[PDB]
Structures are given as structure tokens and as C-alpha cells.
Symmetry: C4
Subunit: 140 residues, 4 copies
């Protein structure tokens, strides 16, 4: 049936927790040319998909223009990954099957200069900094 | 008689449809130096002007400063091209004879650093992404 | 006596008229490193100071931080130059003896990365574009 | 006990006074790769810590993501340094033990592209410009 692509807001990123970086390469290969690194989600446990399976099997993305300078990235997340991410997530199950996040002027120019052509993309686990635990517990 | 240069707003760009990229080269030649790629218009069918005719015959542009950091690009569109674009357009005939679009801080610095001197410019057809059709139909 | 550095706003830049570009070089020499090109003023006639005299004799600038990311450029304009600019100006005599203009996030990073050290600076005349005269007369 | 990381706002930077630049290097070494230079504090006297002691002994920082594009830098300042900075500060003792400052879109991309990994960081004294004294005294 019909759906809507819901927005993955910034609140899903919590300072002090490890992060899942969405890394995108465009026209070339290994940092060959245009790319984007995007803090995607704050997590409790690091993501580690099954041996066999590829991220491409559960994750599909589409970089699209949203104006003369801004760009959005659309997401289609498979149940397995949706379930996975929601259990790792620091923020209460924010992930859905159809999403998108807005890029800023700076991030968008890279997408635009590559005519939105995605070569490869992955989700990398980024550890916490020296004040990480102190930061998240020292709320107001 | 007198006219006004009307603004080509972002609403004319619809995520999920193919796009017409406005590509601009400045002082050098083939990406020799400063350049700009600008999502110009969302289209149903790709643009493909007549054999002979050159884009320069129907299209004239002028990059001008609009402040100490922002720049605007002015357009003068010939009837043939105005008619063409309006029929391809996803958004209801937004194109007029005299227009202009605002560049953002990021895009403007390139224009400024080349003292607004346009060497060449074209309109390229950009295809749709993997979720393209699903994106435009999955409205709210 | 006491004064205030007044702001040189964007309204002094009028699309369609020739411009005076404020060019700044920082730590190195000929585009050796960090630099800034800033549309400074819209003019009717191009600036052309006396044979002998140097711009440095009438113009003094100071790049200063205004926050953790924004920077301002302060100006001290000599009577001769103040008088000159005000007569060339498209906007009604906006120039004063003590001024400053705000840089945007993008422009500021270059100033910041050079620790505000100005090596050289000049005012260059920038001609008008192909639609220049039509642009300024085709007001609303 | 519990605390909050207070924000080091821009008001602590006063145009016309010397500055303390927070310089950060990320994954590589000597400007090897990603870095950040941040106007940190306006001071009356330049900072000059004891012979032996290292800045790392009184200062600890943590670069953390705060959204899909913005980043914050968290600080933990030791009493010695807190006392030092507050006496040099042009703005009335703004420094506290636990702080953080927001980075802008432009500054954040560098932090993000290095996955927030800090290699080294220091506080450099930046002198005043040619109109420095005139600027701070020529208030409104
Ligand atoms: N977020 C970023 C930052 C840089 N880049 C790439 O790095 C090149 C150099 O830009 P930097 O000055 O940011 O290192 C760019 O022209 C672009 O190919 C990118 O594609 N995405
Ligand atoms: N939109 C853009 C992006 C990059 N560029 C060119 O690419 C060079 C490298 O910038 P990037 O880091 O964006 O690749 C710039 O100095 C400029 O000549 C441009 O002219 N317009
Ligand atoms: N407005 C600008 C644009 C570029 N630059 C210089 O050009 C270098 C390459 O940046 P671009 O990608 O903008 O060409 C920068 O690292 C900087 O030294 C500058 O100093 N001021
Ligand atoms: N504030 C800045 C400016 C530049 N840079 C570095 O300088 C490289 C070239 O960027 P510029 O065009 O700004 O000189 C960047 O790819 C990045 O490695 C940085 O890391 N932080």
C-alpha cells in the first residue's frame, strides 16, 4: 500500500554514545572522488551484521535534489535491519521502513557535483571520545 | 516594454523525477577552474534540442553579486526554450522569459572567485535514482 | 574624538552595475595561500586612483574574529578615498571614515585559518555582465 | 557530584583584543590531514603556562556529533587553567570546569570526516591587528 518517507531527525544523535557513520562514495572508487560521511545514529551496542549477508541486502539509498542547492537522501530499510537498529538505538526506536534525512548546503554540494550517482555506501561503527561517558550522564 | 526578472524557486524541483542540471564553467575550460552545477528543473521527459541549434541561441545567463557574499544568476529564455521547458516541467509551467535564481553562500564563493566571468554553460539531463518512482508516488 | 565603526551593508551592492572587488591575500604572496575576494561596492564609474599614490595610503584594514566562527573586517577610509567612492557609488553615499562588514561562515574560515594576518589587499574593477544594463533598468 | 557542560558563547570573543586560538589536528600529524582552528577566547595578556607542565595536563577535549551535520567540542578545564584563563579574559570570568562550544556546518564537516579522532590540540596566542586598539575603544 502507500506510505510516506519519514524524516530521520537529529534528535536520534546523542552526544556521548558511540555512533553509526553512514559513509557514501559517489562516482569513483576508494575516495576516488566525491563522498559523504554522515553521523547516522547513536547506538548502545555496535552494529555487526551476519557473516554472509551484505548491507546492500537490507539497505537501499537514493540521493535526490530538493531545491537548487539542497539535497535529501532517501532510505528503504528491511525488517531485519529495522529491527536491528531499533534495538541498538539510544533514542527510542526512531527507525522506520521508509525514511530520508536532509543534507545541509555544505553536504549537498558534494552530492550535486556527482549528479547523485552512488557507487558504494556503508555504516561504520565510531567509538566514543575521552569524555563520552561523562558527557551523556552529566545531563542538566 | 518593461519587465521584471522573476525568481525560479525551489518548488520547481521535485524529488523522484529526472532533473536538468545547469552546468557552468567560469574562467578556464574543461573544469579548468571554478564551476557550478545547479539542479535547475524537474522534468518528465529529458531535454533534447534540435540538431543544428545551440543552447546559447535560446539561453543567456549573467552571474551577478547581490551582496558582499551572495550571488544571483539572471536568465533570459527564448520562446522556443520557454515553451520546451514548460512542457517537460513536472511543476506547472513555472518558466518565464526573464528569471533569476539565488545561489547560497557555498555556491556564491565560486562565482565570486571568478569575478563572475562565464566561459561556457549547458543543461544536462540527470536520470532518476533507484527509489525515484517510489519516492514521487509515495507522497503523504 | 570618539566614533563608531559603521556597517557597510549589502544594499550598497546593486545587481547590474560594475563592481569594486576587495581582494585580500593573507600569509603568503601571489595566491600563495589563504585569500578573500569580496564584492565591496557597486559603482557607476570605475575606480582609478592617482599615478603616485598607493591604495595603502588611503585605505587601512583589520581582519578580526567576532565569535568562534564569524569574522569582521574593519576599515579606516581617508577623506580622499571616502570622497572618491561616494561619487562613484551607485547607492547614495554609503561610505564613512570608520566601517566594517561581516563575513559569512564560509569566508570567515579562510581569515581564521590565517590567524587574520593580512599581507596585501586591493580594490579591483569588475565589469558588467551580458544582461547588466537590462538587469538594473528592468526593476519591478 | 553532577554537573552540566556549559556553553562557551561568542560574547567571550571581543574584536580588538588579542586572542587564544584553539588549534586541533585530527588523524594525521603536522597538518597531515583534517584540522580546526577556533577563536577560543579574547584576552588581555597572552597565555604562557609553566615550563614543565603540558596543556594536556589541564585541558581535555572531546569532539562529538550533535546531529547529522553539526558537531560540538566538549571541554574539561583544570582549576589551574580555569583560574589562569579567567584572569586573562577580556569578558568577565566566563570559563567553568565543564564546557562545550558549537561548531558550524563548515567546521563540523572536518570533524565528521575524521570520525572525531583528535591527535593533538593547543592554544595559540594571536596578536592584534593595525586597528585593534582603536577598534575596542571606539565602541558606540
Ligand atoms: N565532505 C566532503 C569533504 C570533501 N570531499 C572531497 O574532498 C575534496 C577536497 O575537499 P576538502 O577541502 O574538504 O578536503 C573535495 O573536492 C571532494 O572531492 C567530499 O567529497 N566530501
Ligand atoms: N561547486 C564547486 C565545487 C568545487 N569547485 C572547484 O573545485 C575545487 C576544489 O574544491 P572541492 O574541495 O569542493 O573539490 C575548488 O577550488 C573549485 O575550483 C567549484 O568550482 N565548484
Ligand atoms: N574564498 C576562498 C576560496 C579558496 N581559498 C583557497 O583555495 C584553497 C582551495 O579551496 P577551493 O576548493 O575553494 O578552491 C583553499 O584551501 C584556500 O587556500 C581561499 O583562500 N579563499
Ligand atoms: N578549516 C579547515 C580548512 C581546511 N582543512 C583541510 O584543508 C583541506 C583543503 O581545504 P581548503 O580548500 O579549505 O584549503 C581540506 O580537505 C582539509 O583537509 C581543514 O581540515 N580545516
Amino acid at each position: 500500500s502507500k506510505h510516506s518517507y519519514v524524516e530521520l531527525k537529529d534528535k536520534v544523535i546523542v552526544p556521548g554514545w558511540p555512533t553509526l557513520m553512514l559513509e557514501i562514495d559517489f562516482v569513483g572508487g576508494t575516495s576516488r572522488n566525491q563522498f559523504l560521511n554522515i553521523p547516522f545514529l547513536s547506538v548502545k551496542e555496535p552494529l555487526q551484521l551476519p557473516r554472509e549477508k551484505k548491507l546492500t541486502d537490507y539497505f537501499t539509498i537514493d540521493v535526490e535534489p530538493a531545491g537548487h542547492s539542497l539535497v535529501n537522501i532517501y532510505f528503504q530499510i528491511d525488517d531485519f535491519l529495522l529491527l536491528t537498529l531499533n534495538s541498538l538505538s539510544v533514542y527510542k526506536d526512531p527507525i522506520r521502513k521508509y525514511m530520508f534525512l536532509r543534507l545541509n548546503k555544505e553536504q549537498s554540494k558534494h552530492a550535486i557535483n556527482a549528479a547523485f550517482n552512488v557507487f558504494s555506501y556503508r555504516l561504520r561503527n565510531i567509538g566514543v571520545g575521552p569524555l563520552g561517558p561523562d558527557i551523556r550522564s552529566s545531563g542538566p
